[PDB]
Amino acid sequence: YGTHSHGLFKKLGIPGPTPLPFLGNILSYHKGFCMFDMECHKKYGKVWGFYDGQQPVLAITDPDMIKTVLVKECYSVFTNRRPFGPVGFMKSAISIAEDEEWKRLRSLLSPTFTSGKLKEMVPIIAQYGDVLVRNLRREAETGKPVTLKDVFGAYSMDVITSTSFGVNIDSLNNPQDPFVENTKKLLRFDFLDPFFLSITVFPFLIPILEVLNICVFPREVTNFLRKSVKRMKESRLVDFLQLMIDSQNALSDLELVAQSIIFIFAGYETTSSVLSFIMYELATHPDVQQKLQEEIDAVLPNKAPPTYDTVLQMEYLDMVVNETLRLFPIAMRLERVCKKDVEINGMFIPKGVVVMIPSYALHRDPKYWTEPEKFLPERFSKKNKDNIDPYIYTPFGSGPRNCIGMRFALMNMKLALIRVLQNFSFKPCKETQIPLKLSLGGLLQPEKPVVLKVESRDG
């Protein structure tokens, strides 16, 4: 034994790279998820199959299917995601929860994300828009080429703490010692790490790990937020902990601690990561930074504070964020487990298989997109947009199980653009790598941290 599911795609009839005995196709991840997705797409068309060890992954590319599974069949057959490693009590974090515990948690926290409560958090978020620039200032002063993900990470931290726990620190490399270093440690998993590679060939190793209590969210940090939450509950006799406590807090109590940790996870390094790309695009395109920078002066006259409405009422900003997201869809892949045998717009799909949508690949897909390689915002203006197909462009997923934090993500990032642009300009310096080159790991990240010249707009 060792090639269990390896007959499935030759049978059923789907093309794809032919699996090694124990490894499946994992050896093709030397380029990363993105590059591996591009090629299978080219070299196989619109459906293809591969094996992560002995897990069969079926990538689909037709919008109709991609909508059947993401939308039309969510609660039906494609409800859950792929288990990925020893997850401990975090098994109750919504993004990890399965089937019925999921829908429960989903409608239960979704009220916690509605607009208007977005409205309310804004003054809190803007407050670190201020902090960010008071900080971003000094680094431009010194004349030194600022590392983006450091100023942005901090802001993201600042905004997570404040909106998630009503803890207002200026982490931002200042009070960098209280509550900051556990949070700092909540980074995206790299699923091409040797650790995760091992657990994909030997998934029989997850339960063992589970036993030794070896969890993939580090215990140091989980103890802390778990402790730190509980002490906050009592004291309280806007803020995500707030909105949950009020949320009838059934809705379990030490299941609340799982949400808190997972919101930080999903939002920390993603927000600060996208913000970096956006500032890279706005240099190598100085023209766009200006077109955007003027729009901002137009909507709020010299330095005026950004606002829930000041924001939504900025067509060009919305274009720049959206175009950055196309090039760099942080998740790279949407992905869904098949709960049962089902038919789906043509092809049979057998129970057990993982259905995979190639976000990043569809976003650079010479079909739907012309000069797909190019940062040009105009793709998303009132004319040229909305003949672009959702289910193709999906940087936040789609359907019952999409990014619950999308609005908050966008809002948060814009308030940060505003403050920064309406106050700065950004210029390739010595180190600035041009073009881009993505990491060939399992994260959709720069490879060599983006560093830029920050230059105060007159002072």
Binding residues for heme, as ranges, are: 403
φ, ψ (nearest 5 deg) of residue 160: -65, -55
Distance CA 163, CA 122 (A): 9
Q: Which amino acids are annotated as binding site, given as ranges? A: 403
Map the footprint of ligand STR across residues 306-325, applying CB under 6 A.
none
If binding means CB under 6 A, how many residues of this protein chain bind ligand STR? 7
Nearer to ligand HEM (CB atom), residue 145 or residue 306: 306
First to last CA, the chain: 71
Beta bridge partners of 452: 146
Nearer to ligand HEM (CB atom), residue 113 or residue 368: 113
Contacts of 305 (CB under 8 A, 6+ apart): 126
CB of 431 to ligand STR, least distance (A): 25
If binding means CB under 6 A, how many residues of this protein chain bind ligand HEM? 24
CB of 116 to ligand HEM, least distance (A): 16
Q: Is 171 helix (H, G, I), strand (E, B) or coil?
A: coil
Work out which of 34, 133, 274, 438 binds ligand HEM, going by CB under 6 A: 274
| Amino acid at site 222 | T
Nearer to ligand HEM (CB atom), residue 85 or residue 267: 267
Beta bridge partners of 455: 425
Does position 263 interact with ligand HEM (CB under 6 A)? The reply is: yes
Outline where 166-285 has alpha helix (H): 180-183, 194-201, 206-211, 219-235, 240-246, 256-281
Does position 358 interact with ligand HEM (CB under 6 A)? The reply is: no
Work out which of 38, 124, 201, 216 binds ligand STR, going by CB under 6 A: 216
Q: Do residues 258 and 229 touch, judged by C-beta distance below 8 A?
A: no
Q: Do residues 46 and 61 touch, judged by C-beta distance below 8 A?
A: yes
Is the dihedral angle over the CA atoms 334, 337, 343, 347 positive or is it negative? positive
Is the dihedral angle over the CA atoms 69, 70, 71, 77 positive or is it negative? positive
Q: List the strands of the sheet with 47-52, edge to edge.
A: 47-52, 55-60, 354-357, 334-337
Does position 106 interact with ligand HEM (CB under 6 A)? The reply is: yes
Distance CA 445, CA 150 (A): 14
Nearer to ligand HEM (CB atom), residue 26 or residue 355: 355
CB of 159 to ligand HEM, least distance (A): 9
Residue 193's binding partner out of ligand HEM, ligand STR, none, with CB under 5 to 8 Å set by partner kind: ligand STR
Contacts of 206 (CB under 8 A, 6+ apart): 83, 85, 86, 199
Work out which of 28, 228, 247, 402 binds ligand HEM, going by CB under 6 A: 402
Nearer to ligand STR (CB atom), residue 399 or residue 442: 442
For residue 436, the surrounding DSSP H or E stretch is none
Nearer to ligand STR (CB atom), residue 163 or residue 200: 200
Residue 195's binding partner out of ligand STR, ligand HEM, none, with CB under 5 to 8 Å set by partner kind: ligand STR
Residue 14's binding partner out of ligand STR, ligand HEM, none, with CB under 5 to 8 Å set by partner kind: none
Work out which of 100, 130, 181, 193 binds ligand STR, going by CB under 6 A: 193
Residue-wise burial string across 224-252, b where 16 or more C-beta atoms lie within 10 A, e elsewhere: bbbebbeebeeeeeebbbbbbbeeeeeee
Distance CA 35, CA 44 (A): 14
Work out which of 261, 319, 403, 416 binds ligand HEM, going by CB under 6 A: 403
Q: How far is CA 435 from the centre of its chain?
A: 23
- Inter-CA distances, 321 with 26, 223, 271, 425, 439, Å: 33, 36, 11, 17, 21
CB of 456 to ligand HEM, least distance (A): 27
Nearer to ligand STR (CB atom), residue 219 or residue 437: 219
Place of tokens 């023209």: 287
Is the dihedral angle over the CA atoms 280, 283, 286, 287 positive or is it negative? negative
Place of tokens 């390896």: 6
Distance CA 441, CA 96 (A): 23
Work out which of 84, 189, 224, 369 binds ligand STR, going by CB under 6 A: 189
Map the footprint of ligand STR across residues 34-93, applying CB under 6 A.
none
Nearest residue by C-beta to ligand HEM?
A: 397
Work out which of 39, 101, 139, 190 binds ligand STR, going by CB under 6 A: 190
Nearer to ligand HEM (CB atom), residue 48 or residue 240: 240
Q: Give the binding range for ligand STR (CB under 6 A) out of 91-99, 188-196, 260-268, 428-436.
A: 188-196
Does position 195 interact with ligand STR (CB under 6 A)? The reply is: yes
Q: Which residues bind ligand HEM (CB under 6 A)?
A: 94-95, 106, 262-263, 266-267, 270-271, 274, 330-331, 334, 395-398, 401-405, 408-409
Q: Which residues bind ligand STR (CB under 6 A)?
A: 189-190, 193, 195-196, 214, 216
